[PDB]
From a paper:
ATP synthase is a unique molecular engine that uses the rotation of its subunits to perform the catalytic reaction of ATP synthesis and hydrolysis. Unlike in mammals, mitochondria of the crustacean Artemia franciscana have the ability to accumulate large amounts of Ca2+ without undergoing the mPT. Here, we performed structural and functional analysis of A. franciscana ATP synthase to study the molecular mechanism of mPTP inhibition in this organism. We found that the channel formed by the A. franciscana ATP synthase dwells predominantly in its inactive state and is insensitive to Ca2+, in contrast to porcine heart ATP synthase.
We obtained three cryo-EM maps for the A. franciscana ATP synthase, purified at pH 7.0 for the rotational states 1, 2, and 3a at nominal resolutions of 2.6 Å, 2.6 Å, and 2.7 Å, respectively. State 2 was the most prevalent in this dataset, which we selected for further analysis. The final local refined maps for  F1 and FO at state 2 had nominal resolutions of 2.6 Å and 3.9 Å, respectively. The F1 and FO local refined maps were combined to generate the composite map of A. franciscana ATP synthase. In the maps of A. franciscana ATP synthase (state 2), each non-catalytic nucleotide-binding site in α-subunits is occupied by an ATP molecule with an accompanying Mg2+ ion. The catalytic nucleotide-binding site in the βTP subunit has ~50% occupancy with ATP and ~50% with ADP, based on the weak density of the gamma phosphate present on this site. The nucleotide-binding site in the βDP subunit is occupied with ADP, and the site on βE is empty in all the maps. The intrinsic inhibitory factor IF1 is present in the A. franciscana ATP synthase maps for all three rotational states (state 1, state 2, and state 3a) in the pH 7.0 dataset. In A. franciscana ATP synthase, IF1 is localized at the interface between αDP and βDP subunits in all rotational states. The N-terminal region of IF1 (residues 4-20) is unfolded in A. franciscana ATP synthase structure.
Numbering used by the authors:
A (entry chain R): 3 to 106
B (entry chain H): 15 to 148
C (entry chain I): 11 to 47
D (entry chain 6), E (entry chain 5), F (entry chain 4), G (entry chain 3), H (entry chain 2), I (entry chain 1), ...: 1 to 75
L (entry chain K): 1 to 102
M (entry chain T): 3 to 84
N (entry chain G): 173 to 220
O (entry chain N): 1 to 219
Amino acid sequence: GDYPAEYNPKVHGPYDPARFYGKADVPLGQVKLGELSQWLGRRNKNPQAVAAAVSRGWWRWQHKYVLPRKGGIAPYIQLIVGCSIFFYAINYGKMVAHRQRKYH
Amino acid sequence: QMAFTFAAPSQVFYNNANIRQVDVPSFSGSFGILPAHVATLAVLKPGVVTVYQEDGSTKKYFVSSGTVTVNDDSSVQVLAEEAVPVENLDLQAARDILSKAQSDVTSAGADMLKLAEGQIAVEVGEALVKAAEG
Amino acid sequence: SGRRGRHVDFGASVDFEVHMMRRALKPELRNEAIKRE
Amino acid sequence: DIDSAAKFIGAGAATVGVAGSGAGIGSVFGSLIIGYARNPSLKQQLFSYAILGFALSEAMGLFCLMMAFLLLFAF
Amino acid sequence: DIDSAAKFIGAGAATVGVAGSGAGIGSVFGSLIIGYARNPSLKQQLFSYAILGFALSEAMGLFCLMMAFLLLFAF
Amino acid sequence: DIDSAAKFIGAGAATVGVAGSGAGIGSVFGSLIIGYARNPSLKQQLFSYAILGFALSEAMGLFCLMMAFLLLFAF
Amino acid sequence: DIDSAAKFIGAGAATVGVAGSGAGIGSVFGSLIIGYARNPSLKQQLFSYAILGFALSEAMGLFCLMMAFLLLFAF
Amino acid sequence: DIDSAAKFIGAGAATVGVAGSGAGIGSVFGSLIIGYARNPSLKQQLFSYAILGFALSEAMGLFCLMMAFLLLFAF
Amino acid sequence: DIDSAAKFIGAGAATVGVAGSGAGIGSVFGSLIIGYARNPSLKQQLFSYAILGFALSEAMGLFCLMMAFLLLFAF
Amino acid sequence: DIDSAAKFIGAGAATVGVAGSGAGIGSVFGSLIIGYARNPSLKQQLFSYAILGFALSEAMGLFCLMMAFLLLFAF
Amino acid sequence: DIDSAAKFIGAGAATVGVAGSGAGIGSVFGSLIIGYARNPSLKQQLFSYAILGFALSEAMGLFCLMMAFLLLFAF
Amino acid sequence: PRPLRPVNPGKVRVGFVPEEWFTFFYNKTGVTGPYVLGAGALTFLLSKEIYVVEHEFYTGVAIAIMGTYGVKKFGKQIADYADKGIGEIEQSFKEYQDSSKI
Amino acid sequence: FAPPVNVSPLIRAGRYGALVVGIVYGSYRFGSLQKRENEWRVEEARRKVIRDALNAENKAKATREEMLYLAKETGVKVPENF
Amino acid sequence: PVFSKNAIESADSIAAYDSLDSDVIQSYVEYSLASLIYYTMKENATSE
Amino acid sequence: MMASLFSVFDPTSSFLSNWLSMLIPLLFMVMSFWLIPSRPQFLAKSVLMGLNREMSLLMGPASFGANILVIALFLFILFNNFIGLFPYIFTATSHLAVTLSLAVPLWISFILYTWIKETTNALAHLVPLGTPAPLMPFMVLMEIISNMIRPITLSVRLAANMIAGHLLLTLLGAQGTLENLYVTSIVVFSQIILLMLEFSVAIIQSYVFMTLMTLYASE
């Protein structure tokens, strides 16, 4: 538990957990799908790397829906539906065992 | 913080003095007072008002009648008809008046008003008997 | 109560209550407190 | 065997009736505290009346427990 | 032989009803203490209505105990 | 005789409603002691109201006494 | 007969809810006596709340008596 | 049936807690009368507390009626 | 069958333990009306203590309700 | 075997009647709170009566335990 | 088969007494409401005695619940 | 880049859905696009039994109705209460700086 | 909201073309399964009645055994019918 | 100012004062009157 | 009046097990970045500082800095009762291991610290105060049983509220039909009343358990 070693306060400035502090990689949005295999293989799949990628995404979502001053109830409704959707797919085996239509 | 205004037509005891506890014998029950008490008022009865100041000093003040009022601003106004410390009282005198009161009760007969006065003096005498012997 | 039931005013009750209190002031304070009128 | 069995169920049911004496005793000694907290100079006749309530509430409680034995060994 | 069995269970369950007498007696003699603590000059009149309370509660309790005997010898 | 046996158990379990009469009579007549300890000038108005309360409280006890007989000689 | 026995036992066990209405009536009518000793000039609205207290305490007593017939004839 | 008898016996013993609703309603509505005996001009604010007390007490009434339905059609 | 039959009977007998929770709820919420009637300036703090009373009142009935749920389809 | 089963119902029925000791103990300790709210200088006498109130109400509760123990291994 | 089966009947009827524990806890905390409208300056000492009242009240419910666990699987 | 605190959060339609999702379909299927896909997806999950309409669905409706009523009734008061506390903190910090300079 | 911008003239044709295909396939499959549902429900009902009748006889036998077990446990008299 | 028992019961802020019944209010008012009269009699005598 | 269903407490219904249902309150934690806080951070800070002020009357010296544990226990209970009422989430509090974690380690913490520090006072807590000799031994034995199994009932209490709450909601949902507007509206309105009760009790149950642990950490 520490600040990432790629972070430099002299060039970047103060730390911001929603900004990637490594080498500036081209994001997947502008990949023309001919470099998709190269882009996926280049990005490592360490447990450390994906955990940092989750936190950098989570703080991006905090920066868009909570950290602004006038943060409404919309993030806290999005989380509830997001968790309900995710947990319905987990409990799909118990839910689909009952169903309503015999043929459908 | 409990302002005390225990006065009397004869003497004056406290004037806005901080008291930890005062127990008052009233007609609504011989209850007690602590700072920021219940907003209420009640009528005194013959009994032993006690004073327990911030130093914990215990002082006993027998009264014969009066009024007790506690306001919402933690202001206590106890006014009594003749408040005296109980040390200058006699249990023998208390029973002498009590025996005199019993004679008034027995000799009242059809005089229901005199019967009430005998009952009233009986209550005062019994109050002083417990006051002086305690 | 007995006082109201016998139709006796509380002021009359007060005077009876204080007279019995004053009669139990034997040692020194009976004459000093009672100044009559 | 049936008679001994049904007497066992009945005596178990008869033992509920002491609950009200349990609530009554807890009621009368509750109000004795209030009744002594106001005008404590009458402790002699208050406790005399409070023990009258206890001697009647618990008596009905033992009335149920006496009937419990009557359906356990008498009948 | 189940009729004698049913009477044993029924009389046991009937005897629960004396609990309400127990709580009522403990209530009225509890409130008698509060009543005696406030204006004790009506002691005998208050005690008279207290006995009337006792004679209207325990009577119902022994009315229920009477039904317990009836459930053992009449029903 | 099993159907009659169940009716004997059912009536026996129906006489527990007397406990409702016990607590209600005990609470009302206890409260009358407090209500007559102070303000005895209205001792006829309060007594009339309490007897009304006693009658309604005892009516529930007669309701369960009826229900005990309703499972006894009615079906 | 077995299902008839279930109805009679179920009814005899469901008719104990009137004991609570017996206590609830006693509480309101008990508190009415105390509440009318203090400030008797509010008689009409005091009696209205007492009837309101009775109209909900006794009505929820009939909630179980309805279930008593639901275990007796209907189901 | 044996299991049908178990459902009915459970349902009858599930109607027990209706008595608790009657006692809870009678306590709240009675204590409203004392609380309204003082401050007759405070009718509406104190009425809100009583209906809150009535709603929670009756919620316990339907809480016991929940097990009445579960032992009548579910289990 | 008979093991499951007695599981339903015990579940019904466990549903008994919710009536007193309704009694404790009615006692707190009734006394809350008195508590707000006397010195209404302490409305928020008295409401916190009464809500604290309701927290432990229904929870004691939930113990028996969980015991009812244990003998419904868990034992 | 039937005596084993009938002992279990009766022992459970004997522990129904400890609720009254539960309610009464709360009554006597509840009225300790009111009685010590006013008149705080009688703490020693008031709390000693609360102990006596608890010592007699739980004594009825242990009388339920005595009969529950009597109907679990003794008889 | 009826041994553990009737143990479950006894266990459901053994956990009844937690209801009166709930009634007892509400009695203590309801009386704390009335006891706090007057005398807020004794909040801590009244609460500590009320907790002791609550603890002894919940101990009775656990006393019955332990008896329910005694007949459940403790033999 | 110095991280600057924005004043208002991201735009949101239908309570919780991002507006960036809705505007993502504008250049191809217009404004009605995301609503058409959402309506078709909801119909498909209900019809093909993928969304099981069990007892918990009614609880999900009851939460949604309660949440909409609770937020629309108390949202303005709570947000103003929070903004009041933020303003008091901002006033406290700016008064500290001015008092230190003086 | 934003001003309307017309859809490309291939999304609409694919959309409504798939809309029509779903309707006729919906009609074809629903009719095919409606015949299947009718024939399956008839044979399911017939075997359910036979199974329920046999299960009723088995339940009648088991209840009498249960009633016999109760009378053995209670020790009460055993009637001629039960 | 000196008020009456009937006026005291009808007061707006008298509901905040507790333990109020007919006999308590009646006796308290008829002793508060005899304490105000005694206060004026001492003030009047000294002023005279 | 139709039927009922149960068993919403299976931890391994899928290969992504229901242990993630306990890792959901980590999302709702208000992570703070700016100096001037946001709206939900200030609301959470004001609530927690409010509870700390209210519990400050009951802290005592033995719980000099243990209020963080009590408040964390409060927020954990609240987020395991509030999240247990949302529909497609398994009831975490129904599992006794969550309630085992809630009551058992903290009770052993408080009873062993009391026994080491004040052994005679701990034994005196097992007797009612001012108990005479003939009234002593039966009160001691029952209160020994009381203090031994009191936290076990606390764990039962936290479980039983959400079990009974979720059983009631599933019962009301399963006895309704989508097609019938009258039944659906009755079912929905009944659940709304029940949810208001269940939301209220869940907050109050968390509040009383904070109060009980603050009292029992003071001693």
